[PDB]
């Protein structure tokens, strides 16, 4: 999608892995804010919103919560208190044809700069104030968006490249999504401190013949003590017997 008609995708209700994006060398122009880069997998969020737009090189600094340029203020304005953070990737060769190409459009003329996270698609041509054009292109009345010519050989920061912006917005509702985390191998016959899907304790985790229902995941003993737990990785039920603590 173009910058002014920036495409939005909701990736919520789904676990996404953030580490692979960091290990990518192509997505080198990584400048984002708020949550720590290592802390993406650590935290959970209610929503996962992705915005996408191609722009020139010099516009990397222009589009940010702190810095706002004319193209940044209007086409797509990041929130000042930006909880999500931006990813920028250089894609000059794929986007740009020989001697430039003409497929993307940027919008820069309007009376009012858009509020944060506002999409405007209207092609109504601005009349430059008092002079009414009533929908005809003239010296005062000009088309809101101008054709975007892009090539790596061009000048200071005119190289075209793609930008993807991740916004979390976890405040409203329970955090349905989480980053991948806490994967560890299994050991059976040894007193060990276990954490099986949030179940905290210490004991000997042995193989069990008795089975839960496909519904039920945990299991308690009489007097409300944990007795067996189904293994989340591979669906089988392992019984628990805490290791010996008899006196001497």
């Amino acid at each position: 999608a173009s910058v002014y008609a920036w495409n939005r995708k909701r990736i919520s209700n789904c676990v996404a892995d953030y580490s692979v994006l960091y290990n990518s060398a192509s997505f080198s122009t990584f400048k984002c804010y708020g949550v720590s880069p290592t802390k993406l997998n650590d935290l959970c969020f209610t929503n996962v919103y992705a915005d996408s737009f191609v722009i020139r090189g010099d516009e990397v600094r222009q589009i940010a919560p702190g810095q706002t340029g004319k193209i940044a203020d209007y086409n797509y304005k990041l929130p000042d208190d930006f909880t999500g953070c931006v990813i920028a990737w250089n894609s000059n060769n794929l986007d740009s044809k020989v001697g430039g190409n003409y497929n993307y459009l940027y919008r820069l003329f309007r009376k009012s700069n858009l509020k944060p996270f506002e999409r405007d698609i209207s092609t109504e041509i601005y009349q430059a104030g008092s002079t009414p054009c009533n929908g005809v292109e003239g010296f005062n009345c000009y088309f809101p968006l101008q054709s975007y010519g892009f090539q790596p050989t061009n000048g200071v920061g005119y190289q075209p490249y793609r930008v993807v912006v991740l916004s979390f917005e976890l405040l409203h509702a329970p955090a349905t999504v989480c980053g991948p985390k806490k994967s560890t191998n299994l050991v059976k016959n040894k007193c060990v401190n276990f954490n099986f899907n949030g179940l905290t304790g210490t004991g000997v985790l042995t193989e069990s013949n008795k089975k839960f229902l496909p519904f039920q995941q945990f299991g308690r003993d009489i007097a409300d003590t944990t007795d067996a737990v189904r293994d989340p990785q591979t669906l089988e039920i392992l019984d628990i017997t805490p290791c010996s603590f008899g006196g001497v």
Partner: peptide, 9 residues
């Protein structure tokens, strides 16, 4: 219904 995912017997 079943109040929780706990298994008993």
């Amino acid at each position: 219904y079943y109040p929780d995912k706990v298994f008993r017997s």
